[PDB]
Amino acid sequence: DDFASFQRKWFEVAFVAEELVHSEIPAFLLPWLVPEQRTVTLDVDVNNRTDRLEWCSCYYHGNFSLNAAFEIKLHWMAVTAAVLFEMVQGWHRKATSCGFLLVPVLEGPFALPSYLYGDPLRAQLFIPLNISCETYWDRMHLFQEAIAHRFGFVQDKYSASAFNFPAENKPQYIHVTGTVFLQLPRVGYNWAYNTMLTKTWRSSATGDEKFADRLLKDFTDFCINRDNRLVTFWTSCLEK
Amino acid sequence: SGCRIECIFFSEFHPTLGPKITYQVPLFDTVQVYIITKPELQNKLITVTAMEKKLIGCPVCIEHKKYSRNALLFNLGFVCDAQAKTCALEPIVKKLAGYLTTLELESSFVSMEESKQKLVPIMTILLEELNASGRCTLPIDESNTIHLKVIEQRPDPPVAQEYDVPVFTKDKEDFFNSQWDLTTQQILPYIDGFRHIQKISAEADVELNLVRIAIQNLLYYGVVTLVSILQYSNVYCPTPKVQDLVDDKSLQEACLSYVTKQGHKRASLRDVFQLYCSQFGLMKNLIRRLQKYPYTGCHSYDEICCKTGMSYHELDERLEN
Amino acid sequence: YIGRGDMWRLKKSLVSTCAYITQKVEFAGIRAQAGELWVKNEKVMCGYISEDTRVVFRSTSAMVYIFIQMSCEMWDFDIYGDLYFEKAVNGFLADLFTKWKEKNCSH
């Protein structure tokens, strides 16, 4: 028998984010500027119990994992949560040592209240792209990906977190190694703040919320056309 | 304008090249006064209020000690008259010491000297506005606006026994009826209905300890109690009067000017004073209504108030009977 | 994070044992610290639990919302000389955060 979503499943979305530390350290420091889901029903035990059979259902969203985001949903209507917590932390230790980041991620996207996800206390903060310079929106979306992955190359990588609602209404980026969601809807594009790290699942890659506020300051400076940064970016694009 | 402050001062135990600097606003923090009041302005015991007397006046003060490495120690003092009340000026000085503590722990006023000069117009506006009306809203930060109020500090109220009668000295129609407590709004309608044990089960249906506490607080602010109003005398009526019988003894009893048991002599032997200083009574029927119950204006208060403008009859009536 | 079925499993495993103040009771990766154990008026250093005494679960790791209601009475004085806002925030929140430091909780 499957899981009808009326049954109040306890679910939680852990997440796998391809990362590179070479920009994660200086922006922290003194430098400064085939289907698309898959079900598994696994047994959560590394012990010798012989008292309780213990199972829980993983859903991949990913069957590709090119170099983009990857995410794992956990649905459970089942056994003790603490054993599943040490299983998640066990392959977290296998993730960080010899590999890369696994982070639990709030799978509430930029949702209004009276949705099945979300809170009554979420802002969906807005950041406008003051430009001041056939198919406007598609080419503009590709240029928007270019600015995002430019923050990629200098500080903070991106990933198209292709979530699991049919027809896939809004494009939604997760930043690599941080606390930050973006979506692409004025002219600019909107922002929200992840609240699920909470000082564990923590390494020298991520962390220190001042990092997130610095990325806010740097990103609104680069976005509302400070010194000549967007204009120099225009010249660097036009010279090819 | 009962209390009258006159000088406000800050002081500080300076590093060793200076003894103790002062920031004065106008009396004067002169030489001999500060010499003989030196030992109070440094104490083992901190964060307590202390006032002393001296020949000219009274320092009400409090000192505090912070930044224990090169241990910093300051005090705020508030020097007023020799013999005024000055019981309404203890919590204001203590609250200013608390505000200065949080001002130093957030933004550190008294480590930079331009803010030390800025500390003086604070005192000038305080010295104006305390004697102006008695309260101060005073911003000095993006995170501190000091607020001060003078509380009158009335004395204690007496006990409210179970058989007395409240009377409003003031008028009910001068307050916000919407601004009371619920118990006061459920007592205050039948408050002219004299007996306390009548009014509780007449309208209140409250705990009698609760209506006792409520009438005691109304005695603490604005309502005077007196004793019960059974018709003691009957034979005062053979004098001619112009409709001045009921409120007479209620007023002069509220003036606290009698031995209590009125008998048959009090009313006539001052009713001659009421006659020269200017249907039925159904008098057998105010008796069953007395246990618990499940010229145009009659001259009764106008004449006593317009002769309370004078003082001979209130001498002759404080001298009671 | 402990759903209440696991609390039921701890009470089912704690039917017929002993206890004392500040013991670290464990079962299947689940752990609790014993506290303030009473018989009817008085706190006992040690003792015995058999099937009819009642256990009550408390946390120092809870999720807590603080709704401050503002009105026109915040800017109004009271007796003793204060704003009600200043009483509320300064006095009560200073006391609550000092006790949150003292009992070593993390909400």
XYZ file of C-alpha atoms in Angstrom:
668
model
C 0.000 0.000 0.000
C 1.238 3.462 -0.942
C 1.051 6.757 0.992
C -2.032 8.861 0.448
C -1.073 12.396 1.468
C -4.109 12.711 3.765
C -2.346 10.530 6.321
C -0.014 13.269 7.673
C 3.288 11.742 6.601
C 6.288 12.954 8.536
C 8.533 14.047 5.676
C 11.884 15.782 5.381
C 14.079 16.676 2.403
C 17.792 16.203 2.714
C 19.851 17.567 -0.109
C 23.172 17.028 -1.897
C 24.982 20.106 -3.198
C 28.087 19.949 -5.385
C 30.603 22.367 -3.919
C 34.078 23.876 -4.324
C 35.824 25.456 -1.326
C 38.197 27.761 -3.268
C 35.653 30.582 -3.286
C 33.837 29.488 -0.117
C 36.828 30.477 2.038
C 37.815 33.988 0.728
C 34.310 35.504 0.666
C 34.013 34.199 4.208
C 37.404 35.688 5.019
C 38.924 39.193 4.560
C 38.570 39.050 0.715
C 35.552 41.049 -0.202
C 33.584 42.137 -3.249
C 14.480 7.551 -17.063
C 11.936 9.125 -14.696
C 12.402 12.132 -12.407
C 11.556 10.398 -9.122
C 12.426 7.036 -7.658
C 11.019 5.186 -4.644
C 13.025 2.984 -2.247
C 11.702 1.414 0.973
C 14.785 0.914 3.110
C 15.492 -0.655 6.509
C 16.941 1.872 8.984
C 19.165 -0.213 11.262
C 22.872 -0.781 11.853
C 22.683 -2.747 15.143
C 21.722 -6.157 16.497
C 18.235 -5.303 17.758
C 15.839 -8.219 17.023
C 12.987 -6.273 18.605
C 11.617 -3.862 15.976
C 11.502 -3.966 12.196
C 12.244 -0.466 10.972
C 11.528 0.875 7.481
C 11.154 4.247 5.776
C 10.668 5.420 2.196
C 13.258 7.421 0.248
C 12.304 9.298 -2.904
C 15.002 10.461 -5.250
C 14.183 13.468 -7.246
C 17.348 12.849 -9.189
C 18.150 10.190 -11.693
C 20.715 12.317 -13.489
C 22.833 14.456 -11.090
C 24.753 16.104 -13.936
C 26.548 18.748 -11.907
C 23.339 20.355 -10.609
C 21.459 19.962 -7.317
C 20.400 16.610 -5.942
C 17.678 15.946 -3.390
C 16.386 13.053 -1.321
C 12.965 13.101 0.309
C 12.265 10.962 3.366
C 8.652 9.942 3.956
C 7.980 8.064 7.169
C 4.854 6.963 9.025
C 6.982 4.651 11.022
C 9.672 3.857 13.591
C 11.671 6.015 16.021
C 13.080 9.170 14.471
C 16.398 9.184 16.351
C 17.673 6.034 14.622
C 16.864 7.626 11.274
C 18.696 10.743 12.476
C 21.854 8.774 13.109
C 21.481 7.096 9.694
C 21.263 10.529 8.059
C 24.255 11.698 10.070
C 26.139 8.514 9.166
C 25.958 9.142 5.488
C 26.583 12.809 6.271
C 29.971 11.715 7.616
C 30.380 9.673 4.464
C 29.340 12.752 2.471
C 31.778 15.309 3.895
C 34.803 13.052 4.287
C 35.613 11.780 0.776
C 33.081 13.861 -1.099
C 30.870 16.935 -0.714
C 27.936 18.503 1.103
C 24.730 16.876 2.269
C 22.492 19.462 3.947
C 18.873 19.185 5.110
C 16.953 21.816 3.185
C 13.577 23.423 3.927
C 11.354 22.215 1.118
C 9.080 25.152 1.557
C 9.621 27.222 -1.542
C 8.411 30.801 -1.853
C 4.917 29.813 -0.762
C 2.090 32.019 0.398
C 0.083 31.108 3.505
C -2.924 28.794 3.117
C -0.735 26.537 0.997
C 0.009 22.975 2.066
C 3.601 24.103 2.541
C 4.664 27.349 4.141
C 4.129 29.532 7.182
C 1.945 32.536 7.934
C 5.149 34.497 8.572
C 7.230 34.391 5.370
C 8.241 37.529 3.521
C 9.426 36.379 0.062
C 11.929 39.224 -0.082
C 12.406 41.115 -3.333
C 15.602 42.274 -5.047
C 15.284 44.365 -8.239
C 17.665 44.383 -11.197
C 18.040 48.013 -12.277
C 19.241 47.524 -15.845
C 19.811 51.139 -17.031
C 21.500 50.383 -20.341
C 12.021 38.981 -30.329
C 11.542 36.809 -27.216
C 12.591 39.078 -24.356
C 11.856 36.623 -21.557
C 13.759 33.539 -22.760
C 16.989 35.387 -23.570
C 16.570 37.405 -20.372
C 16.174 34.162 -18.410
C 19.408 32.847 -19.931
C 21.179 36.115 -19.071
C 19.783 35.730 -15.559
C 21.336 32.261 -15.333
C 24.570 33.882 -16.492
C 24.566 36.444 -13.652
C 23.706 33.695 -11.151
C 26.537 31.424 -12.261
C 28.816 34.488 -12.358
C 28.208 34.666 -8.617
C 28.966 31.009 -9.136
C 32.439 31.524 -10.484
C 33.525 34.299 -8.139
C 31.910 33.369 -4.779
C 28.840 31.210 -4.617
C 27.770 28.442 -7.036
C 24.163 27.807 -8.089
C 21.972 24.876 -8.910
C 18.608 24.619 -10.603
C 16.819 22.694 -7.847
C 14.327 21.016 -10.168
C 11.613 20.174 -7.642
C 8.702 17.769 -8.005
C 5.535 19.597 -8.866
C 4.072 18.850 -12.330
C 4.473 21.461 -15.134
C 7.161 23.129 -12.933
C 5.754 26.634 -12.552
C 8.611 28.789 -11.362
C 12.386 28.424 -11.849
C 14.060 27.964 -8.478
C 17.769 28.143 -7.690
C 19.530 26.975 -4.553
C 22.884 28.465 -3.780
C 25.742 26.089 -3.157
C 27.177 26.176 0.377
C 24.865 28.601 2.068
C 21.444 29.512 3.344
C 19.815 31.038 0.287
C 16.964 30.369 -2.176
C 16.125 32.360 -5.307
C 13.304 32.309 -7.837
C 12.791 34.041 -11.151
C 9.310 35.576 -11.610
C 8.954 44.178 -11.953
C 12.247 43.235 -13.568
C 14.285 41.681 -10.746
C 13.941 38.401 -8.892
C 13.209 37.271 -5.422
C 15.003 35.835 -2.445
C 14.454 33.807 0.707
C 16.482 32.569 3.629
C 16.931 28.906 4.559
C 16.241 28.147 8.236
C 17.227 24.474 8.493
C 21.006 24.471 8.995
C 20.780 25.504 12.700
C 24.520 25.158 13.517
C 24.831 21.431 13.053
C 25.251 19.716 9.692
C 27.992 22.302 9.751
C 31.507 22.403 8.342
C 34.125 24.989 7.434
C 32.523 25.232 3.991
C 29.196 26.726 5.100
C 28.225 28.616 8.187
C 28.499 31.854 10.142
C 25.264 33.770 9.249
C 27.317 36.922 8.742
C 28.246 35.095 5.492
C 24.604 35.208 4.414
C 24.276 38.875 5.323
C 27.503 39.645 3.423
C 26.075 37.878 0.389
C 22.948 40.033 0.738
C 25.055 43.198 0.797
C 27.315 42.120 -2.077
C 24.347 40.920 -4.124
C 22.274 44.075 -3.745
C 25.370 46.126 -4.579
C 26.007 44.067 -7.727
C 22.301 44.061 -8.544
C 21.398 47.782 -8.389
C 24.407 48.617 -10.601
C 27.187 49.749 -8.318
C 30.416 51.123 -9.318
C 30.243 50.072 -12.957
C 29.874 46.338 -12.308
C 26.865 45.550 -14.496
C 28.182 47.838 -17.240
C 31.584 46.146 -17.202
C 29.726 42.826 -17.250
C 27.891 44.054 -20.360
C 31.199 44.892 -22.035
C 32.713 41.524 -21.060
C 29.680 39.810 -22.583
C 29.585 41.947 -25.744
C 33.293 41.411 -26.491
C 32.666 37.862 -27.729
C 3.840 72.807 42.967
C 4.591 71.390 46.398
C 8.146 70.104 46.087
C 10.750 72.467 44.632
C 14.090 71.136 43.408
C 16.898 73.519 42.635
C 20.170 71.828 41.638
C 21.132 68.664 39.784
C 24.643 67.277 39.617
C 26.690 64.440 38.205
C 30.009 63.496 39.724
C 32.811 61.060 39.028
C 35.871 59.834 40.872
C 38.535 60.988 38.449
C 41.825 59.211 37.803
C 44.354 60.205 40.392
C 45.419 63.617 38.983
C 41.890 64.856 39.692
C 39.953 63.917 42.826
C 36.290 63.982 41.742
C 34.877 65.995 38.849
C 31.357 67.411 38.945
C 28.827 68.483 36.318
C 26.519 71.032 37.956
C 23.309 72.701 36.914
C 21.666 75.387 39.139
C 22.238 76.640 45.326
C 25.723 75.517 44.320
C 27.963 72.500 44.942
C 30.323 74.576 47.049
C 33.552 73.683 48.838
C 32.678 72.827 52.445
C 29.467 70.958 51.559
C 31.271 68.682 49.123
C 34.128 68.182 51.602
C 31.812 67.062 54.401
C 29.686 64.958 52.023
C 32.731 63.293 50.413
C 32.376 60.048 52.501
C 28.868 59.319 51.274
C 29.858 59.780 47.609
C 32.121 56.712 47.802
C 30.694 53.625 49.523
C 31.245 49.916 49.846
C 27.499 49.440 49.364
C 26.466 50.463 45.860
C 23.111 50.611 44.021
C 21.120 51.839 47.036
C 19.480 55.212 47.481
C 20.890 57.489 50.165
C 19.979 61.034 51.158
C 21.619 63.219 53.762
C 20.781 66.522 55.392
C 22.968 69.606 55.629
C 22.600 73.267 56.721
C 21.567 74.464 53.261
C 19.816 71.436 51.788
C 19.561 67.754 50.935
C 21.513 65.593 48.490
C 19.399 62.647 47.397
C 21.912 60.479 45.613
C 22.976 57.130 44.281
C 26.380 55.962 43.108
C 27.363 53.137 40.836
C 30.616 51.365 40.001
C 31.427 49.785 36.626
C 34.423 48.836 34.430
C 36.275 47.177 37.300
C 39.713 47.318 35.622
C 40.803 50.861 36.452
C 37.585 50.658 38.458
C 35.182 53.371 37.319
C 32.788 54.953 39.784
C 30.261 57.722 39.234
C 27.204 59.099 40.994
C 24.076 61.063 40.230
C 22.927 63.460 42.913
C 19.836 65.570 43.168
C 20.116 68.396 45.688
C 16.910 70.013 46.950
C 15.674 72.055 49.917
C 16.429 71.360 53.584
C 12.833 70.643 54.666
C 10.549 69.787 51.772
C 8.824 66.450 51.227
C 11.378 64.726 48.901
C 9.763 61.302 49.218
C 8.570 61.571 45.604
C 12.146 61.941 44.336
C 13.779 58.676 45.358
C 12.624 56.401 42.455
C 13.297 59.074 39.833
C 16.958 59.298 40.852
C 17.250 55.511 41.109
C 15.668 55.127 37.672
C 18.071 57.690 36.205
C 20.939 55.628 37.628
C 19.518 52.562 35.884
C 19.198 54.454 32.597
C 22.792 55.684 32.858
C 23.895 52.091 33.503
C 22.257 50.804 30.320
C 23.487 53.850 28.371
C 27.021 52.991 29.402
C 26.647 49.288 28.664
C 25.249 49.877 25.156
C 27.006 52.974 23.804
C 29.435 54.081 26.587
C 28.605 57.749 27.232
C 31.101 58.557 29.940
C 34.181 57.265 28.150
C 34.003 60.010 25.481
C 33.971 63.638 26.550
C 31.751 65.257 23.904
C 28.954 63.034 25.218
C 30.042 64.172 28.670
C 29.368 67.744 27.545
C 26.109 66.505 25.985
C 25.236 65.142 29.443
C 24.757 68.725 30.754
C 21.805 69.944 28.564
C 20.094 66.740 29.695
C 20.293 68.195 33.204
C 19.109 71.632 32.058
C 16.027 70.219 30.338
C 15.363 68.035 33.406
C 15.658 71.017 35.766
C 13.207 72.960 33.628
C 10.694 70.210 32.975
C 10.465 68.614 36.423
C 9.440 71.927 37.960
C 7.373 72.731 34.868
C 4.814 69.924 35.109
C 6.380 66.810 36.675
C 7.109 64.463 33.765
C 9.755 64.135 31.068
C 9.902 62.378 27.716
C 13.471 62.937 26.596
C 15.213 61.183 23.665
C 18.999 60.906 23.709
C 19.591 58.004 21.348
C 18.156 55.904 18.577
C 17.650 53.343 21.365
C 16.860 55.352 24.544
C 14.187 57.922 25.341
C 14.122 58.408 29.101
C 10.679 58.751 30.676
C 10.035 60.156 34.149
C 6.908 60.825 36.220
C 6.399 62.304 39.689
C 4.167 60.024 41.788
C 2.381 61.950 44.540
C 2.886 59.145 47.139
C -0.283 59.544 49.166
C -0.449 58.155 52.740
C -2.064 54.855 53.693
C -5.857 54.493 53.752
C -7.811 53.430 56.848
C -9.806 50.230 57.181
C -13.208 49.876 55.491
C -15.519 48.225 57.987
C -18.544 46.243 56.893
C -21.201 48.743 57.962
C -20.015 52.198 56.834
C -21.311 54.395 53.992
C -19.343 55.813 51.042
C -19.891 59.370 49.833
C -18.360 60.921 46.731
C -16.662 64.154 47.666
C -15.948 64.619 43.962
C -18.408 64.039 41.112
C -18.853 60.847 39.116
C -19.513 62.786 35.894
C -15.895 64.044 35.627
C -14.259 60.686 34.852
C -14.225 58.219 31.993
C -16.861 55.642 32.921
C -15.233 53.404 30.315
C -11.906 53.749 32.172
C -12.453 51.913 35.439
C -12.234 48.376 36.666
C -15.180 46.043 36.229
C -15.826 45.905 39.975
C -15.828 49.685 40.240
C -18.231 49.890 37.298
C -20.480 47.331 39.016
C -20.359 49.121 42.392
C -20.392 52.831 41.344
C -24.096 52.981 40.190
C -25.649 52.259 43.596
C -23.060 54.094 45.668
C -25.500 56.729 46.910
C -27.581 53.872 48.335
C -26.016 54.295 51.662
C -25.399 51.024 53.469
C -22.471 48.914 52.265
C -24.141 45.600 53.066
C -27.205 46.873 51.209
C -25.349 47.804 48.040
C -23.386 44.534 47.800
C -26.426 42.270 47.498
C -28.503 45.012 45.905
C -26.433 45.292 42.748
C -22.996 43.803 43.231
C -23.551 40.167 44.352
C -19.820 40.103 44.988
C -17.588 38.713 47.685
C -17.799 41.074 50.630
C -14.028 41.015 50.997
C -13.850 42.165 47.354
C -16.227 45.095 47.771
C -14.306 45.935 50.968
C -11.036 46.107 48.998
C -12.715 48.157 46.251
C -14.157 50.758 48.616
C -10.801 50.888 50.426
C -9.014 51.794 47.195
C -11.685 54.391 46.419
C -10.976 55.722 49.911
C -7.283 55.771 49.024
C -8.081 58.053 46.090
C -11.388 59.912 46.260
C -14.345 58.662 48.389
C -14.990 59.452 52.080
C -16.643 56.944 54.422
C -19.025 57.774 57.277
C -21.403 55.957 59.630
C -24.936 54.745 59.033
C -27.957 56.889 58.418
C -30.829 55.438 60.442
C -33.081 58.186 61.746
C -31.661 58.618 65.261
C -33.500 61.844 66.034
C -37.094 62.655 65.172
C -37.747 65.771 67.220
C -35.510 68.127 65.244
C -38.390 68.747 62.797
C -40.453 71.375 64.817
C -38.284 74.175 63.548
C -39.268 75.818 60.230
C -36.770 74.932 57.506
C -36.772 75.307 53.743
C -36.353 71.626 52.705
C -32.898 71.124 54.229
C -33.103 67.969 56.322
C -31.432 64.878 54.839
C -28.078 66.000 53.422
C -27.396 68.224 56.473
C -26.101 65.590 58.867
C -24.443 63.707 55.995
C -22.318 66.758 55.155
C -21.435 67.678 58.716
C -20.641 64.044 59.462
C -18.409 63.941 56.368
C -16.646 66.994 57.842
C -15.767 64.712 60.834
C -17.301 67.041 63.371
C -19.390 64.950 65.794
C -19.510 62.493 68.548
C -21.307 59.680 66.789
C -24.502 58.914 68.738
C -26.549 61.922 67.638
C -29.541 61.283 69.918
C -31.926 64.263 69.965
C -29.790 67.406 70.638
C -27.079 67.707 67.945
C -29.431 68.518 65.076
C -31.396 71.305 66.784
C -28.420 72.880 68.554
C -26.712 73.348 65.218
C -29.913 73.776 63.215
C -30.218 77.191 64.801
C -26.856 77.850 63.084
C -28.226 76.510 59.824
C -31.309 78.711 60.109
C -29.326 81.882 60.836
C -26.464 81.121 58.426
C -28.521 81.271 55.245
C -45.083 65.867 51.962
C -44.579 63.767 55.046
C -41.246 62.477 56.120
C -42.830 58.984 56.359
C -40.335 58.606 59.186
C -41.594 55.251 60.505
C -40.874 53.604 57.160
C -37.100 53.852 56.581
C -36.701 50.895 58.936
C -37.832 47.829 56.974
C -35.710 48.989 54.009
C -32.585 48.790 56.148
C -31.503 45.126 56.300
C -29.993 43.270 53.334
C -32.104 43.545 50.180
C -32.045 40.574 47.737
C -34.804 76.696 47.052
C -35.059 75.074 43.624
C -32.051 73.019 44.413
C -32.346 72.195 48.093
C -29.738 74.329 49.881
C -27.571 71.732 51.556
C -24.081 72.070 50.052
C -24.155 75.573 48.564
C -24.486 77.314 51.927
C -21.773 75.297 53.651
C -19.371 75.821 50.738
C -20.055 79.554 50.420
C -19.478 79.869 54.151
C -16.442 77.552 53.855
C -15.132 80.509 51.895
C -15.073 81.974 55.417
C -13.845 80.168 58.522
C -15.804 81.205 61.642
C -18.523 78.578 61.346
C -16.032 75.839 60.612
C -14.178 76.863 63.756
C -17.523 76.723 65.603
C -18.338 73.389 63.932
C -14.957 71.651 64.111
C -15.540 72.426 67.740
C -18.114 69.770 67.393
C -20.892 69.298 70.026
C 12.995 14.705 18.628
C 10.754 12.143 20.313
C 7.244 11.325 19.198
C 4.991 10.265 22.025
C 5.024 6.577 21.091
C 8.679 6.543 22.087
C 7.672 8.147 25.382
C 5.258 5.237 25.756
C 8.113 2.822 25.068
C 10.245 4.475 27.766
C 7.413 4.230 30.283
C 6.891 0.589 29.281
C 10.584 -0.045 29.893
C 10.514 1.924 33.173
C 7.873 -0.169 34.941
C 9.807 -1.921 37.706
C 13.139 -0.211 38.367
C 14.967 2.262 40.616
C 15.958 5.876 40.143
C 17.816 8.728 41.784
C 18.337 12.416 41.106
C 20.333 13.138 37.899
C 20.554 9.736 36.279
C 20.885 9.478 32.487
C 18.215 6.971 31.472
C 18.728 5.460 28.020
C 16.791 3.206 25.657
C 17.588 2.555 21.965
C 19.480 5.751 21.244
C 16.920 7.746 23.264
C 18.033 9.527 26.400
C 16.567 11.499 29.284
C 17.823 13.031 32.505
C 15.896 12.335 35.692
C 14.614 15.221 37.748
C 12.528 16.387 40.735
C 11.177 13.076 41.971
C 8.462 13.483 44.612
C 6.432 11.426 47.059
C 3.346 13.495 47.831
C 5.074 16.345 49.642
C 8.792 15.729 49.540
C 11.632 15.293 47.079
C 13.577 12.061 47.457
C 17.247 11.499 46.680
C 16.605 7.971 45.349
C 13.822 5.410 45.242
C 11.767 2.793 43.419
C 9.252 2.935 40.546
C 6.649 0.172 40.082
C 3.860 0.476 37.548
C 1.594 2.942 39.433
C 3.711 6.038 39.972
C 3.396 8.596 37.202
C 6.202 9.965 35.036
C 5.950 13.315 33.266
C 8.091 14.364 30.300
C 9.559 17.847 29.883
C 12.023 19.384 27.463
C 14.775 21.969 27.430
C 14.842 21.897 23.625
C 11.417 23.204 22.651
C 9.974 25.375 19.889
C 8.525 28.546 21.337
C 6.741 31.618 20.006
C 6.571 34.931 21.868
C 3.702 37.199 20.862
C 4.078 40.709 22.276
C 0.740 42.491 22.141
C 1.053 46.257 21.768
C -1.641 48.779 22.636
C -1.889 52.363 23.818
C -1.189 51.157 27.337
C 2.480 50.584 26.484
C 3.024 54.336 26.392
C 1.112 54.786 29.671
C 2.658 55.028 33.111
C 1.680 52.930 36.091
C 2.303 52.943 39.805
C 6.005 52.702 40.881
C 6.943 54.810 37.852
C 7.620 52.945 34.576
C 6.261 52.343 31.150
C 4.508 48.997 30.908
C 6.683 48.315 27.866
C 9.780 48.948 29.926
C 8.495 46.724 32.742
C 7.614 43.943 30.250
C 10.708 43.913 28.054
C 13.393 45.042 30.527
C 12.276 43.255 33.701
C 10.489 40.167 32.396
C 12.638 39.423 29.352
C 15.862 40.023 31.291
C 14.643 37.568 33.935
C 13.510 34.989 31.371
C 16.758 35.099 29.443
C 18.844 34.845 32.621
C 16.854 31.764 33.623
C 17.269 30.369 30.107
C 21.014 30.721 30.605
C 20.925 29.240 34.118
C 18.973 26.078 33.382
C 21.103 25.591 30.213
C 18.284 25.219 27.706
C 18.346 25.796 23.962
C 15.073 26.667 22.252
